[PDB]
């Protein structure tokens, strides 16, 4: 599924990301835009054999188990396939654990490169929430 910008903003707000651990909603919408372009089925095989899955490109080396990555740790205690659903429940649950580490949203390279330091609020502006 490819979410519309406002559609994802409303969904993420419903999934409790409006002000989760100090991060405003715009951060999450912006992150999704640059990590997967709002596509829940997005996948990106990495060099180390790991793969980034879903709308928030969660990595198989540290967060989910896809059964094909070397030093997998499965910090989110969940199969990567669950992060490829049109239902963002699992991706949000795992993203919350990720951001709960001291590194916060810096875990998302695209967010760091294209969102951090920008007017992220713009990503939820002009939306019925």
């Amino acid at each position, epitope marked *: 599924k490819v979410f519309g910008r406002c559609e994802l903003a409303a969904a993420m707000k419903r999934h409790g990301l409006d*002000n*989760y*651990r100090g991060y405003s909603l715009g951060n999450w919408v912006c992150a999704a835009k640059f990590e997967s372009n709002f596509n829940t089925q997005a996948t990106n095989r990495n060099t180390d054999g790991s793969t980034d899955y879903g709308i928030l490109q969660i990595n198989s080396r540290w967060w989910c188990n896809d059964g094909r990555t070397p030093g997998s740790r499965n910090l989110c*205690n969940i199969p990567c396939s669950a992060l490829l659903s049109s239902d963002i429940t699992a991706s949000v649950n795992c993203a919350k654990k990720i951001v709960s580490d001291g590194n916060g949203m810096n875990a998302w390279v695209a967010w760091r490169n294209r969102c951090k330091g920008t007017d992220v609020q713009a990503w939820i502006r002009g939306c019925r929430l």
Partner: antibody, heavy 113, light 107 residues
């Protein structure tokens, strides 16, 4: 599967450092976030803090920075240190993973002169 | 800190009857509220995560609902094994905080 268990002294003196250990069995401590929670008399629960995969820690300001949570991979366990304890620190201490799915059995620690 | 208030403090019910437990937050916490059950001489047990998400291994009679500042834990047809303490805990902001608990007893 995973098992957690607290261990350490059940009786400590005022002003000393209270230390507890949580031994994890079934998987590596490097594969989750680890927490400490305590229950005071009167069913009052307080989240003490947790240490995440990167080593970063989050401590409840209520502890006024008297707390330290560390890990030891070789022994697959993590610890809780609480300095300058007072009778207000008497409680049942529990270790549990960040998700809340796995808990130790809890251990009562009484601070008394 | 985010303050969680639970009510009623105590609730007596006859097995077979249903009940609802309330947990209200001093400020919005989205869906970041987990429910725990705790029996004497025992550690807490997670019943519901993120306001309404089910937990594998928990009886289906337990359900949660709510968002923002108002949440409830419902038990459809209470059983004797359900008597004990119930606590809500928010994870929206650090420090995580717990409600004062609701005691469920046999009437």
């Amino acid at each position: 599967d995973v098992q957690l268990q607290e261990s350490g002294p059940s009786l400590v003196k005022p002003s000393q450092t209270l230390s507890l250990t949580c031994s994890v069995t079934g998987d590596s401590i490097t594969s989750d976030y680890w927490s400490w929670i305590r229950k005071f008399p009167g069913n009052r629960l307080e989240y003490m803090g947790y240490v995440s995969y990167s080593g970063s820690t989050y401590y409840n300001p209520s502890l006024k920075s008297r707390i330290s949570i560390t890990r030891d991979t070789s022994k697959n366990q993590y610890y809780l240190d609480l300095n300058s304890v007072t009778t207000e620190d008497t409680a049942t201490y529990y270790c549990a993973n960040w998700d809340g799915d796995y808990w130790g059995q809890g251990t009562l620690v009484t601070v008394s002169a | 800190d985010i303050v969680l208030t639970q009510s009623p403090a105590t609730l007596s019910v006859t097995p077979g009857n249903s009940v609802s437990l309330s947990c209200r937050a001093s400020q919005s916490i989205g869906n970041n509220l987990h429910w725990y059950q705790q029996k004497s001489h025992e550690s807490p047990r997670l019943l519901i995560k993120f306001a309404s998400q089910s937990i594998s291994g928990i009886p289906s009679r337990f359900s949660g609902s709510g968002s923002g500042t108002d949440f409830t834990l419902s038990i459809n047809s209470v059983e004797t094994e359900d008597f004990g303490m119930y606590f809500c805990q928010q994870s929206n902001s650090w420090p995580y905080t717990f409600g004062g608990g609701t005691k469920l007893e046999i009437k």
